[PDB]
Design a protein around this ligand. Structure first.
Ligand SMILES: *[C@@H]1O[C@H](CO)[C@@H](O[C@@H]2O[C@H](CO)[C@@H](O)[C@H](O)[C@H]2NC(C)=O)[C@H](O)[C@H]1NC(C)=O
Ligand SMILES: *[C@@H]1O[C@H](CO)[C@@H](O[C@@H]2O[C@H](CO)[C@@H](O)[C@H](O)[C@H]2NC(C)=O)[C@H](O)[C@H]1NC(C)=O
Ligand SMILES: *[C@@H]1O[C@H](CO)[C@@H](O[C@@H]2O[C@H](CO)[C@@H](O)[C@H](O)[C@H]2NC(C)=O)[C@H](O)[C@H]1NC(C)=O
Ligand SMILES: *[C@@H]1O[C@H](CO)[C@@H](O[C@@H]2O[C@H](CO)[C@@H](O)[C@H](O)[C@H]2NC(C)=O)[C@H](O)[C@H]1NC(C)=O
Ligand SMILES: *[C@@H]1O[C@H](CO)[C@@H](O[C@@H]2O[C@H](CO)[C@@H](O)[C@H](O)[C@H]2NC(C)=O)[C@H](O)[C@H]1NC(C)=O
Ligand SMILES: *[C@@H]1O[C@H](CO)[C@@H](O[C@@H]2O[C@H](CO)[C@@H](O)[C@H](O)[C@H]2NC(C)=O)[C@H](O)[C@H]1NC(C)=O
Ligand SMILES: *[C@@H]1O[C@H](CO)[C@@H](O[C@@H]2O[C@H](CO)[C@@H](O)[C@H](O)[C@H]2NC(C)=O)[C@H](O)[C@H]1NC(C)=O
Ligand SMILES: CCNC(=O)CCc1cccc(Br)c1
Lengths: 711, 72, 126, 67
């Protein structure tokens, strides 16, 4: 034999796969560099043929079990083919799930937000909403884009995601998994390897523990950014509260990088930009690639395959034909390595060259492994490798030695704090976001979070873990998580968290080999053959051995440790604590940007109606908002002589309780930024209080508008 | 019921003291601030009135909480 | 020839008479657009209740689904209900009558009126 | 109403429906939706337009813009 016939199948598969796969990879590379309808069909056909082959082999794998298999190599490859996935679900179920996926992706990709002033002007996310959330500093404009994004695509994705979760859970359970979240946590789980065995739930425990270790550093980062956000947005951020979600520098606040502009530690101190020296030395995309190649050779990692140089898009085509410019370390397989990108003579492109070629290094290293064992130890291994490469190249020492940076250059501690803070905005900033998103999804898939509490717990977790508060209350009709790409396009996120830890562990380990005597933040692992050896140990390993063992191959550990990440930001941390000496460090999970104008309203029924008391449902709540809108309209048309078309939707109700207590704040008919002041609202309430009581058969005693005192 | 937004009529004479401590455990910081009077029926009886108060303060009040108050 | 009275929506239209001064006399508020807005909202509330209770169907009826016509100084008008986002889907008068019947008290309460003053022509107390 | 991502303008999409579509529901949708989306956006503008146009013609020695 069974184990022998299993090996026989895998061997046959590997040989055939390599060629069939080559076609698919090559075909795509050709189109990616050609972008021709002819090539579209070519890659499409190749993909179908390749995918079909894999499917057929999956069935063959099933025949041979894994228990009687003793050899790990064969066992691993067999498991990697035997995986049934959505095939376990019925044709109808699979087709529906596929439709859900397509619809969700289409909504996200083609969803438009029309400007309230002019409906004819409608912005998509990527081109318009992104240039606002990344560039626009107008509180109102930022709020508009943020709220509208969740008020349109997010709402459409709400029902889709719900069904998606159900079908995904079915598939995972049918594939012998606790939930779809457990299905995802299978990636790190390791079995039958003594002293390397890993568990899906163990991943959760590890991530949570490590998150607690970074908690304090993030707290200081939040406190510092909070102060700066307060200056950028006066009367919009409380010094003890959370951070409005629409002011985090992007649509979802995933990175704080854009906040760097307003949070720069030392404005006078700029950042090293060799993009000019490169041009002065007549640097080229090819030049920077050769420099990346030399960087690897300096640490012993081999030179780029001559063939790679022959077949690699290392610049913009800028001809009759066009090509995808996205940096990509292509591995066509059967000893074929390539890189597609429209790179230029820019410091970023220089660092990107090191990053992309670093991936190629990993690909080449595990290229000797079995077809199914040619991949990063885990999902967060390959990207981490790329990251450390770019980091070492970014080091001023590297630029100075390569001539990009002046030998006479002096790196001021202030400039270093500037560098470190900018990195913290991209790294420490995404750690809570990534943790909280995966925690929420995991809970949702395992049923910890009921559908009626999805949005409820989403914003509770956001206020607590991330210290971020919603600028406007979002009920379960909203699907803010789905409004993010990875959620809407069914992707895991814990990869990013684990990658960040791995990257710093790898860098620090390589620094130890490099015998670096400076801060890890400015550690340059270039010219470190020994460090290259450690990296290579896991590089060549591929997926043949467990990721925990691969960690030992470089970092010399089994589980991920955030200590190296903390060590890297230790200088910044000290500075942050110094800056946050006077300021409050923390946040209030109770602070809301709309709490000030929020009127709490207790509805008493058994006290007044008693017997035959109507039950307060969503329709009762519908009537209430409509009643408030009515009062606002009357008040404006009479007191201010302004016929304003107030609507129940302008009535932003929040904190609904079984006591029938809630807080509501009226806003402008079509301007979320324009929230009607509590004073004016109280005047409207008093004017129609009788009528409101009539609508619910209640009275001032039963219908308590806290603050609105009956006379 | 107010300080803890309990559903109106969830807490009664049958379940006051157990929901005092329960809610205390649930949120003590948000329970301590609550103020409770010593509502004991027995004391209300030992609460004697001085002077002419039995006719002009005890009977006259009790009459107002009895239908046909004016006749009474 | 043609008659300038037939409408494609007259069939499911409910005529409504409103008698504020009959039930209020003094302190009788003037029926304005705001009162009309409130009315459409009240009807939407009823439709929702009826559907969620009788049909167990959570249909999100809004004041916009309540299509009012022939508004007169008598405070008489003709309304019909449509599906939440389907102009073609007109809720049949039968269902609407049942929805009204169910919440008639509530509607009367909202306008401090009564079956007599709030004449829902075709709906009657028993 | 089903798919918010598919938005037809008048020149080709709405006109082909009103010229070809023989579906009472589809035709009613196009007709009503056109007046409900664009017709409302023109109401306030048309009002101002009328006022200014009359002024101009009156100042050009005319009873109204109609005259
Ligand atoms: C697991 O299978 C691999 C695959 O054959 C074995 O690797 C081989 O080992 C023999 C003995 O040294 C060599 O002659 C072959 O050339 C190797 N082949 C390959 C492709 O690696 C490995 O020894 C087996 N191990 C166990 C645990 O059975
Ligand atoms: C993937 O499909 C295979 C094919 O059926 C499953 O393997 C079977 O599992 C059941 C339950 O243990 C056995 O009774 C069958 O004899 C197995 N058949 C074969 C030929 O493998 C496998 O369990 C499925 N795995 C998942 C992920 O659901
Ligand atoms: C890594 O070591 C190489 C080997 O010396 C360095 O390359 C040199 O850089 C200096 C500075 O420009 C030149 O003066 C030498 O002539 C270069 N020698 C060779 C053989 O390349 C490289 O700069 C080092 N990198 C770092 C970060 O220290
Ligand atoms: C970089 O280091 C210098 C050297 O200490 C720092 O300059 C000091 O700043 C503090 C705070 O204002 C003063 O109390 C010291 O007297 C300064 N010392 C000297 C000798 O300049 C500077 O603040 C540091 N910049 C950063 C990274 O925070
Ligand atoms: C929508 O409402 C908001 C808030 O009422 C308006 O933004 C304010 O504009 C004034 C005048 O420029 C500023 O002084 C305030 O600081 C703004 N408020 C905030 C919260 O930033 C906004 O201009 C209105 N826009 C529209 C669409 O009517
Ligand atoms: C929109 O409304 C129209 C008109 O009621 C619907 O058309 C009818 O719908 C019912 C129930 O679906 C069917 O029994 C009829 O046969 C339909 N034919 C007609 C009137 O054209 C239409 O289905 C509704 N569409 C949506 C999107 O709700
Ligand atoms: C076009 O402009 C001329 C210039 O003013 C107008 O001529 C005047 O008309 C008024 C009213 O008849 C007289 O009081 C002025 O004395 C005229 N001035 C001149 C210089 O001609 C003429 O009326 C305008 N056209 C129209 C039709 O209103
Ligand atoms: C007016 C002075 N009198 C009193 O206060 C008490 C009188 C009184 C109270 C109840 C029953 C009777 Br009999 C008498």
């Amino acid at each position: 034999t069974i184990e022998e016939q299993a090996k026989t199948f895998l061997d046959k598969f590997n040989h055939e796969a390599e060629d069939l796969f080559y076609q698919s990879s090559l075909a795509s590379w050709n189109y990616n560099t050609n972008i021709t309808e002819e090539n579209v069909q070519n890659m499409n056909n190749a993909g179908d043929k390749w995918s079909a082959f894999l499917k057929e082999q999956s069935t063959l794998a099933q025949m041979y079990p894994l228990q009687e298999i003793q050899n790990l190599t064969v066992k691993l490859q067999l498991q990697a083919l035997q995986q049934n996935g959505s095939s376990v679900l019925s044709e109808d179920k699979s087709k529906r799930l596929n439709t859900i996926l397509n619809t969700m992706s289409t909504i996200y990709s083609t969803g438009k937000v029309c400007n309230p002033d002019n409906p004819q002007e409608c912005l998509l996310l990527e081109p318009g909403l992104n240039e606002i959330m990344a560039n626009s500093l107008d509180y109102n404009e930022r709020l508009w884009a943020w709220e509208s994004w969740r008020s349109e695509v997010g709402k459409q994705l709400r029902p889709l995601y719900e069904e998606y979760v159900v079908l995904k859970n079915e598939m995972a359970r049918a594939n012998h998994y606790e939930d779809y979240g457990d299905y995802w946590r299978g990636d790190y789980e390791v079995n039958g390897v003594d002293g390397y065995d890993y568990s899906r739930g163990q991943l959760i425990e590890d991530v949570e523990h490590t998150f607690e270790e970074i908690k304090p550093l993030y707290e200081h980062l939040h406190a510092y950014v909070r102060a700066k956000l307060m200056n950028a947005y006066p009367s919009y951020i409380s010094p003890i509260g959370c951070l409005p979600a629409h002011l985090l520098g992007d649509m979802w606040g995933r990175f704080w990088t854009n906040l760097y502009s307003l949070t720069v530690p030392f404005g006078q101190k700029p950042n090293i930009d060799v993009t000019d020296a490169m041009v002065d030395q007549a640097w080229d995309a090819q030049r920077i690639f050769k420099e990346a190649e030399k960087f690897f050779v300096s640490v012993g990692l081999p030179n780029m395959t001559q063939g790679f140089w022959e077949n690699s898009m290392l610049t913009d085509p800028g001809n009759v034909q066009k090509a995808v410019c996205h940096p990509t370390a292509w591995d066509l397989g059967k000893g074929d390595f390539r890189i597609l990108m429209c790179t230029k003579v820019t410091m970023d492109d220089f660092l990107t060259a090191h990053h992309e070629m670093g991936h190629i290094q990993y690909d080449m290293a595990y290229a000797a492994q079995p077809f199914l064992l040619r991949n990063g130890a885990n999902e967060g291994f390959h990207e981490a490798v790329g990251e450390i490469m770019s980091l070492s190249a970014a080091t001023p020492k590297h630029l100075k030695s390569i001539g990009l940076l002046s030998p006479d250059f002096q790196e001021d501690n202030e400039t270093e704090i500037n560098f470190l803070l900018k990195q913290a905005l991209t790294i420490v900033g995404t750690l809570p976001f990534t943790y909280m998103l995966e925690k929420w999804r995991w809970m949702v898939f395992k049923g910890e979070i009921p559908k009626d509490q999805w949005m409820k717990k989403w914003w509770e977790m956001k206020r607590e873990i991330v210290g971020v508060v919603e600028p406007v209350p979002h009920d379960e009709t909203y699907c803010d998580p789905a409004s993010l790409f990875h959620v809407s396009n069914d992707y895991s996120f814990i990869r990013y968290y684990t990658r960040t830890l791995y990257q710093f562990q790898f860098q620090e380990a390589l620094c130890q080999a490099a015998k670096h005597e400076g801060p890890l933040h400015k550690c340059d692992i270039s010219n470190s053959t020994e460090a290259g050896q450690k990296l290579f140990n896991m590089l060549r390993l591929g997926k043949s051995e467990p990721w925990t063992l691969a960690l030992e191959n470089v970092v010399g550990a089994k589980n991920m440790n955030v200590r190296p990440l903390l060590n890297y930001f230790e200088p910044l941390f000290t500075w942050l604590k110094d800056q946050n000496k006077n300021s409050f460090v923390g946040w209030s999970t109770d602070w809301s940007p709309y709490a000030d104008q929020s009127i709490k309203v207790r509805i008493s029924l058994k006290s007044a109606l008693g017997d035959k008391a109507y039950e307060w449902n969503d329709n009762e709540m519908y009537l209430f908002r409509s009643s408030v809108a009515y009062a606002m309209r009357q008040y404006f048309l009479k007191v201010k002589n302004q016929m304003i078309l107030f609507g129940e939707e302008d009535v932003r109700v929040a904190n609904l309780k079984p006591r029938i207590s809630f807080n509501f704040f009226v806003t402008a008919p079509k301007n979320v930024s324009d929230i009607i002041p509590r004073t004016e609202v109280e005047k409207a309430i008093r004017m129609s209080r009788s009528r409101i009581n009539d609508a619910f058969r209640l009275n001032d005693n039963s219908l308590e508008f806290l603050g609105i005192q009956p006379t | 019921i107010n300080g803890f937004d309990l559903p109106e009529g969830n807490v009664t004479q049958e379940n006051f003291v157990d929901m005092q401590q329960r809610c205390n455990a649930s949120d003590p910081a948000a329970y301590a601030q609550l103020v409770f009077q010593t509502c004991d029926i027995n004391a209300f009886l030992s609460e004697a009135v001085e002077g002419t108060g039995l006719a002009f303060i005890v009977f006259t009040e009790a009459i107002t909480k009895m239908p046909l108050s004016p006749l009474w």
